[PDB]
């Protein structure tokens, strides 16, 4: 068995860089497959959906390979992934590292201690264009877990992210 | 300005990577445009040359199959001379593991070059080198993996 | 201001980077430093290196460096607000430290440090087991408390099948 | 076997990486070895020996090829000055060795240093690093010569050469 990790804030290319790792051992006949968080399990186009993934675990039983899009939304990820690996299966996990605060989210930390390779990407940043590491909230929210796209965060570089 | 690269075999990524890197800088509100290789098996070209005039008003060009295009290194070069990021996806070698025309040449004016690696499509390893199924030889036939395979070293050897 | 940041297990090369990364701005005749730990058994040029077991002693005088180096960063329980208070004053520090313990338990406090980090990768030893790539420690001894110091002689890097004892 | 290869130009922190490449096989256990080349060698502030730790020295790889024999792991930077080196480095590989090698891509003309770059298609890694440029202090990427020189090969230290980005290459 084996894992991956990848990290890094929004706009980073994370999902994206997920799927290039996924299609890798898929186009070398691997039994693959994609669970990512819904917010209500439902199959899509290929890959399932959940928000929690000891939910599949049963249908997923038979795939080598697995891929996470928002890893930190599943409260039982370290432990799932974790266990997965020992049973011979590639876990490819993509999700965020820090919050809107830049603090851990949920539990997802721990899970790279037991993780074969970890890399975080950087994002552009969209204010003063440099090399964007952290995500900011637009609105003058709370609640950690809040979805949104390029209409609601930012990708900004260090310098930018303080107010 | 400011030059990309990225190599490896086949099965490697090498494309999906690309514009992965492109997002980035298009969802930062940037000019970003994609040439690929035409007459096969975003824009469109042969030769980077021609298109020079259209993309002139893009900050950011991606080019999948980069080694396709003869006019390829003094383009890029060029391009980023002018301010602009090129982000070039091609492969370093061919099915006898040559380098690809002139493209070499390309990654010593490069900020940045990685090199990627496949599944081995044989061992079922790190697939470092593109190898033909085919008993052919002209060096450029288009293909998927009915054509080709990532293979190890030890695959590659016939 | 900006934070670098290794990781992985021993073997590594871990160590051996960081400096790397320092030179660089050395090279580039930056002001650098390298805060260590009270342990182990480095090289030449010019104004380098400290040596503390808390980074908030060591603030002082390291106050008008521009680089700092810090192999082992998860033995500084104070480590975390040290980096960032200090990136938060223009200073580059890049870190190399473990992730996880012999139990692959993370580290002192040490994972909250890689969010608020602009760079972060983990390296990849040898196994010396099965010889493929070692991503996780494990100590030989029969032992327990969580920090003792040692080389090769005392933990080995190890591939997952093999960690498993 | 199996190929590494480690690029970008002066005070990129090459020849470092690979010896942190090759302590890694070596603490191991592992049979580890370092060419290197010599002819104008100082820097500053054939045969075995240690320091990099058990490496030899020469001018072209095709010599030493007998001892380095038994060593599954080989290391050596400034790749670019064996001319023999590709060919060298394959063969090598295909026996079961693994090799790593530091090297510089371009010249400070920003030309391909000697056959080198035919050595990154039969590589299973490659990387390029970069540098701190030594005039607006951002990512260098290109080495430059400050004398007003020619002649390709010529050795030195900063004394010498500058890692410079692209809007400072143009001199
Ligand atoms: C920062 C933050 C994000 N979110 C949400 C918004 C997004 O839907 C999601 C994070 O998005 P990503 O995982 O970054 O989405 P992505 O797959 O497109 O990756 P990338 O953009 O880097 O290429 O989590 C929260 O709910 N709370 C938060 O504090
Ligand atoms: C190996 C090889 C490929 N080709 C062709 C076949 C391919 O259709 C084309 C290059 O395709 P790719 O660049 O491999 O397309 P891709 O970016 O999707 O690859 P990857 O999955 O790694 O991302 O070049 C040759 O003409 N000659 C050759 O020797
Ligand atoms: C795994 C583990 C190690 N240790 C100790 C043993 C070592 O002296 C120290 C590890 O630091 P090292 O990673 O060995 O520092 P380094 O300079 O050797 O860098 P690298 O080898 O990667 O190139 O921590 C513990 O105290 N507790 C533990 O659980
Ligand atoms: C650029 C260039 C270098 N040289 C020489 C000078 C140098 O001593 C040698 C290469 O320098 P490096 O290989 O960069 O020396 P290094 O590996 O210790 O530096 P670093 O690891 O930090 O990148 O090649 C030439 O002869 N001609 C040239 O055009
Ligand atoms: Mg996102
Ligand atoms: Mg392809
Ligand atoms: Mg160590
Ligand atoms: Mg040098
Ligand atoms: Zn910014
Ligand atoms: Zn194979
Ligand atoms: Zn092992
Ligand atoms: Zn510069």
Do not use: W
């Not at 799927?19 to 186009?45: E, G, L, M, P, W």
């Not at 990820?77 to 996990?93: L, S, T, W």
């Not at 552009?124 to 609640?143: D, H, I, P, Q, W």
Request: glycine fraction near 6%.
């Amino acid at each position: 068995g084996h894992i991956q990790l990848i990290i890094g804030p929004m706009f980073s290319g994370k999902s994206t860089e997920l799927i290039r790792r996924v299609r890798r051992y898929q186009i070398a006949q691997y039994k693959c497959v994609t669970i990512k968080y819904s917010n209500d399990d439902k199959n899509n186009f290929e890959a399932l959906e959940a928000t929690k993934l000891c939910d599949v675990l049963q249908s997923i039983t038979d795939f080598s390979v697995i891929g996470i899009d928002e890893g930190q939304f599943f409260p039982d990820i370290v432990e799932f992934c974790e266990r997965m690996a020992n049973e011979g299966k590639i876990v490819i996990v993509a999700a965020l590292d820090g919050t809107f605060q830049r603090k851990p989210f949920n539990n997802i930390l721990n899970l790279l201690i037991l993780s074969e390779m970890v890399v975080k990407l950087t994002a552009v940043c969209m204010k003063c264009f440099k090399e964007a590491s952290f995500s900011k909230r637009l609105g003058e929210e709370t609640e950690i877990e809040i979805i949104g796209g390029n209409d609601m965060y930012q990708s900004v570089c260090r310098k930018c992210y303080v107010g």
